[PDB]
């Protein structure tokens, strides 16, 4: 948090919204190759 | 069946790797393999609905 809040102090709304796409991009794409993988069950119908 | 059916037809020779129809007592004379037959039939028959 402190790094982040200070790299942002000369221009906060432009560089905070420059860097909303990589963080968000990297939690997204966290832990998809592992090969043991951990999940939680889940049932439902047909339909997707 | 549009393989079969082009202008250069007469003049081709065809390969065939594979046959039809199947000899289904060799798929069933594998020992023990009623169970592994049903989740085959199952995995490429079944369809899905509501």
């Not at chain 1, 796409?21 to 339909?47: C, E, H, N, R």
Request: glycine share 4%.
């Amino acid at each position: 948090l402190r790094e982040f809040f200070i790299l942002c102090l000369p221009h906060p709304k432009k560089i905070n919204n420059v860097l909303r796409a990589p963080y968000s991009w990297f939690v997204k794409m966290w832990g998809v190759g592992a090969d043991p993988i951990v999940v939680l069950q889940s049932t439902a119908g047909d339909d997707r | 069946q549009e393989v079969l059916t082009d202008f250069r037809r007469q003049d081709t020779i065809w390969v065939l790797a594979l046959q039809l129809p199947v000899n289904p007592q060799v798929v069933w004379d594998v020992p023990r393999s009623s169970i592994a037959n049903l989740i085959m039939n199952i995995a490429t028959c079944l369809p899905t609905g509501e």
